[PDB]
Amino acid sequence: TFISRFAPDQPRKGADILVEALERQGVETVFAYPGGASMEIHQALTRSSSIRNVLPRHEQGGVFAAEGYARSSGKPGICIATSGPGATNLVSGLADALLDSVPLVAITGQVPRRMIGTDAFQETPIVEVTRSITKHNYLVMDVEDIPRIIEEAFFLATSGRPGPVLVDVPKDIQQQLAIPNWEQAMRLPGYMSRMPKPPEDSHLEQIVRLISESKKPVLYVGGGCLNSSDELGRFVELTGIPVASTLMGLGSYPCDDELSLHMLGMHGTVYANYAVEHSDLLLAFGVRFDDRVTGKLEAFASRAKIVHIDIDSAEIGKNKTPHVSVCGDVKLALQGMNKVLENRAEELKLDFGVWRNELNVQKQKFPLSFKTFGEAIPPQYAIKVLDELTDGKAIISTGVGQHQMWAAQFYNYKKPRQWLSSGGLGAMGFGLPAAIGASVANPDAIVVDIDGDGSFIMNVQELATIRVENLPVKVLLLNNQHLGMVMQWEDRFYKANRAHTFLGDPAQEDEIFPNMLLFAAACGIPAARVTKKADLREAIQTMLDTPGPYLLDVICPHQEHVLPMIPSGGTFNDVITEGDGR
Amino acid sequence: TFISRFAPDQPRKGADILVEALERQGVETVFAYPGGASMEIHQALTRSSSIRNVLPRHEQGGVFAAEGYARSSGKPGICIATSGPGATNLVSGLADALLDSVPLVAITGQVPRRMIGTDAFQETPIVEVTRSITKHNYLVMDVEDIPRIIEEAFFLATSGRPGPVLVDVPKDIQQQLAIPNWEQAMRLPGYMSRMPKPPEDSHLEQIVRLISESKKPVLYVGGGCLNSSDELGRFVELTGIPVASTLMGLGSYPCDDELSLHMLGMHGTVYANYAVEHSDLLLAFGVRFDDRVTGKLEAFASRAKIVHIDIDSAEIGKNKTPHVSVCGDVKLALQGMNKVLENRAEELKLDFGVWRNELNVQKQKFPLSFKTFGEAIPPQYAIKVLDELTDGKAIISTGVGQHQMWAAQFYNYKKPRQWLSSGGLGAMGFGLPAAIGASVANPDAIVVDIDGDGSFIMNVQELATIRVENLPVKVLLLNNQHLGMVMQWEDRFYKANRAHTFLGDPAQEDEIFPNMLLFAAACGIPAARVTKKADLREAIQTMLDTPGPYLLDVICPHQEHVLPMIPSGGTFNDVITEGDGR
Amino acid sequence: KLEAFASRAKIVHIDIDSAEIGKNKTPHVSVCGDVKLALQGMNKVLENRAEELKLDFGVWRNELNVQKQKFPLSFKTFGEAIPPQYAIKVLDELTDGKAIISTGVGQHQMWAAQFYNYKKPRQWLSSGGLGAMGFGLPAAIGASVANPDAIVVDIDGDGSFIMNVQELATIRVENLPVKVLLLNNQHLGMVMQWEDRFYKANRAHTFLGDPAQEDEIFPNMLLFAAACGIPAARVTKKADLREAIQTMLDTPGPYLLDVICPHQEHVLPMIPSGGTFNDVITEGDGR
Ligand SMILES: Cc1cc2nc3c(=O)[nH]c(=O)nc-3n(C[C@H](O)[C@H](O)[C@H](O)COP(=O)(O)OP(=O)(O)OC[C@H]3O[C@@H](n4cnc5c(N)ncnc54)[C@H](O)[C@@H]3O)c2cc1C
Ligand SMILES: Cc1cc2nc3c(=O)[nH]c(=O)nc-3n(C[C@H](O)[C@H](O)[C@H](O)COP(=O)(O)OP(=O)(O)OC[C@H]3O[C@@H](n4cnc5c(N)ncnc54)[C@H](O)[C@@H]3O)c2cc1C
Ligand SMILES: Cc1ncc(C[n+]2c([C@@](C)(O)OO)sc(CCOP(=O)(O)OP(=O)(O)O)c2C)c(N)n1
Ligand SMILES: Cc1ncc(C[n+]2c([C@@](C)(O)OO)sc(CCOP(=O)(O)OP(=O)(O)O)c2C)c(N)n1
Ligand SMILES: Cc1ncc(C[n+]2c([C@@](C)(O)OO)sc(CCOP(=O)(O)OP(=O)(O)O)c2C)c(N)n1
Ligand SMILES: COc1cc(C)nc(NC(=O)NS(=O)(=O)c2ccccc2OCCF)n1
Ligand SMILES: COc1cc(C)nc(NC(=O)NS(=O)(=O)c2ccccc2OCCF)n1
Ligand SMILES: [Mg+2]
Ligand SMILES: [Mg+2]
Ligand SMILES: [Mg+2]
Ligand SMILES: [Mg+2]
Ligand SMILES: [Mg+2]
Numbered sequence A, B: 001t002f003i004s005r006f007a008p009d010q011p012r013k014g015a016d017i018l019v020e021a022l023e024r025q026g027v028e029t030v031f032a033y034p035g036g037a038s039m040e041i042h043q044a045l046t047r048s049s050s051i052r053n054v055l056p057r058h059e060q061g062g063v064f065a066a067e068g069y070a071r072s073s074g075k076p077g078i079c080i081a082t083s084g085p086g087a088t089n090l091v092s093g094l095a096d097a098l099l100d101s102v103p104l105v106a107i108t109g110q111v112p113r114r115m116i117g118t119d120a121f122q123e124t125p126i127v128e129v130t131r132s133i134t135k136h137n138y139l140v141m142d143v144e145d146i147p148r149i150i151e152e153a154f155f156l157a158t159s160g161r162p163g164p165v166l167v168d169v170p171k172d173i174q175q176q177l178a179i180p181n182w183e184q185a186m187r188l189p190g191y192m193s194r195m196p197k198p199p200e201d202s203h204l205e206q207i208v209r210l211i212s213e214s215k216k217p218v219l220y221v222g223g224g225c226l227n228s229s230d231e232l233g234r235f236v237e238l239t240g241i242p243v244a245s246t247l248m249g250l251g252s253y254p255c256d257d258e259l260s261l262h263m264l265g266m267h268g269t270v271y272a273n274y275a276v277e278h279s280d281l282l283l284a285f286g287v288r289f290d291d292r293v294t295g296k297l298e299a300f301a302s303r304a305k306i307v308h309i310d311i312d313s314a315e316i317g318k319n320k321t322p323h324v325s326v327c328g329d330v331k332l333a334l335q336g337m338n339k340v341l342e343n344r345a346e347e348l349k350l351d352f353g354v355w356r357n358e359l360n361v362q363k364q365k366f367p368l369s370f371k372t373f374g375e376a377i378p379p380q381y382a383i384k385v386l387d388e389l390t391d392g393k394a395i396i397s398t399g400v401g402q403h404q405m406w407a408a409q410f411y412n413y414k415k416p417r418q419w420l421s422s423g424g425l426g427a428m429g430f431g432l433p434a435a436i437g438a439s440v441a442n443p444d445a446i447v448v449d450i451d452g453d454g455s456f457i458m459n460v461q462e463l464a465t466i467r468v469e470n471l472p473v474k475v476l477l478l479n480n481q482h483l484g485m486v487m488q489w490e491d492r493f494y495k496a497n498r499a500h501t502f503l504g505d506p507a508q509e510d511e512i513f514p515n516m517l518l519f520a521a522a523c524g525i526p527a528a529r530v531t532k533k534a535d536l537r538e539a540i541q542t543m544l545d546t547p548g549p550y551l552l553d554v555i556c557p558h559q560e561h562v563l564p565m566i567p568s569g570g571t572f573n574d575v576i577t578e579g580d581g582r
Numbered sequence C: 001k002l003e004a005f006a007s008r009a010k011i012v013h014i015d016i017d018s019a020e021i022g023k024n025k026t027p028h029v030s031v032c033g034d035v036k037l038a039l040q041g042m043n044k045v046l047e048n049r050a051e052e053l054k055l056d057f058g059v060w061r062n063e064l065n066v067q068k069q070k071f072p073l074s075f076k077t078f079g080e081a082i083p084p085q086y087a088i089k090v091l092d093e094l095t096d097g098k099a100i101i102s103t104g105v106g107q108h109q110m111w112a113a114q115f116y117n118y119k120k121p122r123q124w125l126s127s128g129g130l131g132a133m134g135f136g137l138p139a140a141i142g143a144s145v146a147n148p149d150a151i152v153v154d155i156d157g158d159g160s161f162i163m164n165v166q167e168l169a170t171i172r173v174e175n176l177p178v179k180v181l182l183l184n185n186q187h188l189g190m191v192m193q194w195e196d197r198f199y200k201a202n203r204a205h206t207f208l209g210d211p212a213q214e215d216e217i218f219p220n221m222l223l224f225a226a227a228c229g230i231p232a233a234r235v236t237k238k239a240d241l242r243e244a245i246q247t248m249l250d251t252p253g254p255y256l257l258d259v260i261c262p263h264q265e266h267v268l269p270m271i272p273s274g275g276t277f278n279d280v281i282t283e284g285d286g287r
């Protein structure tokens, strides 16, 4: 049973009830930054012997760290901020967690209840601000509600389609004395009654039947499969269907595998987008048919029967209309379909080697390619060397931009939750704090933040967090001195007319600005810069072998372009396969 | 007349119409950070020969810089961000501008109109998110509306009670060709019909009459008086009434003046709070009776006739019920009352020298005081030396915390808009970006960011902005290695139990962590650290005399406390005048 | 027009809702609180400091009483047609001003406000802010249940009365002594008046009768009362009005009196919307 630090008849502060509510959820780590409206919560945290606090240097760092914790572990991430300016600094993280379906519980202090609505000191209506960028939120109006609301928040954040839940706690409720009741029933009758049931054998056998009748099936795998790598891998054994993955699904099926078509979509491989373009059966498991993937919807999988299995009924038929649909956990659907495939194996005689051979011809004519100019370091090459020296077992977090795409293309993720990247919102500054959360959740792992120079500086203050918490976070900084992805679009569509994409100092144009090594130096983090491709392998090896945190500044020619590229709203026939800024 | 870069019959992109709309408003500076949804706006900016863009390193830096620009100049600040994660990074600045009544126009790119509502790439419903933390906002749904909406946004941001206005612009509207109509009438019939009229002589003479009937009048001056320093000063000549100022009103009446009671409220001077406590006439000009100032409302000015002049009818009677009220521009009310006072001067025979003498006794028994321990640098002393070496003529911006209060107490601001500080929301990380905006708006001024070590690191990335834009921003960093204000409350109310307020490295407890000098070094900004009080004067002098940016790391004992302190919700009889963390 | 309203007065506003103080008109002095307490406090001050104050406004009162004699509320009597103003005055007399009055919305509402002398508050039940037709009959039902011994009269218009005529069944079944004084002008009277003043008497769907039988009272409200077992009568000649109202009052239980009135009557005086005192209309009708 659970052991409380208080007697069952002993009144204690609401802040102490809230912390014990976290303890009763199995919480061991929080990311909490103190302020006036949350001082009581922070005092109660020091009284907890089972919950560790990682103090960020910015609440956006706190929420992004909670995301990295969640994405790398499957557990909910918990961040805590004070009222007013603390709460508003969470907003980008809440939106990011909602768009990527990341389970997250955010607790904000609030001004006393009687002060609400009066423009009080450090008051913002955070429940109103965040209603459209959270899965649910609460304003606690009585200390007796703390056990129930915390329980509901964790249940909502982690069940169904996961997402962020914000709990706003007025300071007077934190100080009120009460005796908690941990037996209160949750008040989610509508939500709980609309929870998907395990899929029926009726629907599952229709799918297995559709597979046997098809000649060109393609698996279309996304973020919803992160807990189904075993079931999915078994499914691929029994069917031999090639696997195309989204940015969010990377690693659900191993990238180094022969049946892997790698990533599809705007910057997906030519052969992955080819497969979807010419398929007759599209198995869309745990995906939401977003515009980065589909392009022009009418042309996406235009001659395929579309099977869509999603745990969110609101996603089924939202953009692309499926032929067959299953609303439920893809993990269960895979388990059920795997049994059918095992028994009726010899009756089905599944063989797609002719389709696979057609795709492997595309895989040989159009592989992912990069150019090497003299001794300049290709960013693609740097990530490939990191893959080798870490044996593809590192947890990878990124910023947003060209380096993000290259980290997606040129690292072979073997398991899900190695890949931590902001996909739906695409928020710069995510990589460094996310690596902080992933390292705390996986203390023995290799954690590398593959960051861009614009993204890295946005939350550079979290270097102090990495040092103080003694986290072995590695930073592989692909430094092209530009806002690279926006620069690439300037080259393609605006005649290379630069509009504020250069991040260096124009007074000293040929100097690396700023000097990221001194940012690491300021926080006592060893660092180095590498410029010549000949030095890169030993440089990365040094970063990995040096215990504790390390920053490697990898200088790269800025004229590189992420390829291939299907322009926004385009079709497969519009794919760009050559060119850069030279 | 205005000269357009386009022919009156020449169609141009909506992005070009939007930039010309800014030009037609007199905009010369914007703070714009590019992204996909705003690329068209940034391209159109490069075509403008009269608008400069200051590229921040974080959109929170962009909005805070726009605030500093506005607060230091009286002109609206303009920041521009892309959709999704760019827009959400503005949120703290919007809330901060609304709570402090700062005029501000924020432009966000948005996904194409047809994509809105579909969870598109980098889409957040920013108009929904910001509705409660902006004065007004817009979603442009037609390119023909751009002239009218921009005009309305600037009008709303700058008229009445100033505040932020957000304008959300879908990317397809930015690309659409049209011929603008600059003659469209605004659609603000309700707002414009409820605008306060110039105050009637009826109301103004009743006030002058109430002054002559009073023995203990106190002026209570706040942020609403920032454009009335001349009228207010003339008013004080004619009446001899002593002036108590809020945090937002500092400098409206000169601090070095003999009639100045300095700041009132929670950390106000004993004599300012004494005056309000025992006054019989309280002239509340441009104030909102916030809880930091009043304490327990029933006890605040409990035996005074309260005259409240506010331009926002919703503020009059919101917390404290006045006897007399004037809803209008305090600038006009002062002008009208000054005429009455000039004519009826000898008939009034105003003399409050007996009340003034009673207050000057309190001013001598309870002045602002600090202690000097050995050679340790008192933060109060450092600010006083900065006052002297700059002759009280520097523009000062701050973070939030103890250093903020000390910068309010120990610098004698001579004019309004020298003092740039986040008062209502109290957002850390404001000081450095605000100094950026103030320097761009006042190129010849001395600009000093008096920052705390927690506040300074939150937006340390803007050091790159200061270097690249070659701005002579000085940073006076009061480094106590703690979240000082929260530490002080731990000492007073939680038995000095530290709950995550220490910002240094516990592994090397007696080392200054992090090393802010290397943060400045990374961005090519000269820096120095001073530890001994004997070295402080020359150190500050060096910072001032060295051309361009400069960071001075001033080490201070952390056990200092901001005094005096009326505890939250307390009365004058609860004021704390002694003690610290020693 | 707000700028012209009390344009040379010091304005004291006592309201229990702080959001109302200074919302439209900016006061000089304000008290946010219960006006009952403010009156009690001010009454004590006035009692004690009575002889020190020497309050006398008889000169101002005399100036107003001159206006009260030159411009009283007036109505015209045409032959034997029943003036609605007269009907309400007769109801006042026969009930001694002690009846609870509820109304619909329109001309009859204004006349019930002008020509009945309410002696106590909560005798007057009328929809003022929203001005919802169909209020009078159900409101009378609630007032009678709350005041079983009172005289309750619904002074209703023919448009307003028919909107919730179904509550006649409620009045019968609950055996409530609700009286209905129906001022029947066969029109949506208040909208008709504005058509006369501002739209050249161009009728736009304000006639409530049957155009096929133009000179017939339509509908027959007496049969509505008959359907619900409620005694009823119609009066057309001013000579018959007093006995008709007396019958309604003396007959125990519910009763409907259909009072036919010339439709060309206008509510006077009238300050046009957004106007000033100098714009007041004091004469004219639809004739
Ligand atoms: C610069 C940039 C470029 C990008 N370009 C690309 C690109 O070329 N290709 C690409 O793929 N992405 C790209 N993206 C990422 C992108 O915008 C989206 O994040 C991604 O494409 C959508 O991932 P998803 O389809 O797997 O759905 P997710 O966002 O991962 O959501 C999971 C889906 O599965 C469902 N689900 C969740 N759990 C379960 C369960 N247990 N059972 C069943 N269903 C479940 C959810 O309801 C939801 O519909 C890019 C991002 C950036 C920032
Ligand atoms: C850590 C911390 C401690 C603080 N402690 C104190 C403290 O001890 N003392 C203190 O004073 N503050 C303190 N504050 C600041 C504080 O919370 C408020 O920002 C400040 O007290 C309110 O300023 P104000 O009363 O002048 O109203 P403002 O926020 O400045 O608003 C201006 C007011 O005047 C009106 N107005 C605007 N323009 C006009 C015009 N042309 N004519 C007429 N009216 C106009 C507006 O409607 C509004 O009502 C502290 C802040 C922090 C962060
Ligand atoms: C908070 C935030 N602000 C602005 C953004 C708009 N974007 C991008 C995009 C694609 O989302 O535009 O739609 S990518 C990008 C530039 C990335 O600079 P880098 O870190 O150096 O990486 P690289 O390897 O050089 O490319 C910007 C400015 C963003 N997403 N987040
Ligand atoms: C975005 C943000 N996050 C947290 C905040 C909560 N607060 C404070 C308060 C008073 O608003 O609490 O109500 S002040 C403060 C600590 C200030 O650290 P320093 O910069 O070093 O300055 P010092 O001279 O040492 O005191 C915190 C943590 C805040 N306002 N903004
Ligand atoms: C639900 C409802 N619908 C329509 C209304 C619009 N109005 C009116 C007004 C003033 O509110 O117009 O602004 S008054 C009126 C006509 C009243 O018909 P009567 O009952 O016969 O009374 P009378 O003695 O003849 O005048 C209408 C149609 C209304 N208020 N409520
Ligand atoms: C410089 O002022 C500080 C500083 C610190 C460190 N803490 C607080 N704490 C409170 O003021 N607590 S409060 O009485 O419940 C309160 C009353 C009214 C409005 C808000 C409010 O809380 C806001 C949270 F700060 N104030
Ligand atoms: C990596 O993808 C990138 C990168 C860059 C630099 N720019 C863009 N631009 C667009 O995609 N423009 S869009 O066709 O109108 C569009 C269509 C659908 C959804 C959103 C949307 O715009 C979002 C703003 F980016 N995309
Ligand atoms: Mg190579
Ligand atoms: Mg870059
Ligand atoms: Mg008076
Ligand atoms: Mg000294
Ligand atoms: Mg500090």
Ligand SMILES: [Mg+2]
Pocket: C077, C086
């Ligand atoms: Mg008569």
Ligand SMILES: [Mg+2]
Pocket: C106, C157, C158, C159, C183, C184, C185, C186, C187, C188, C189
């Ligand atoms: Mg009628």
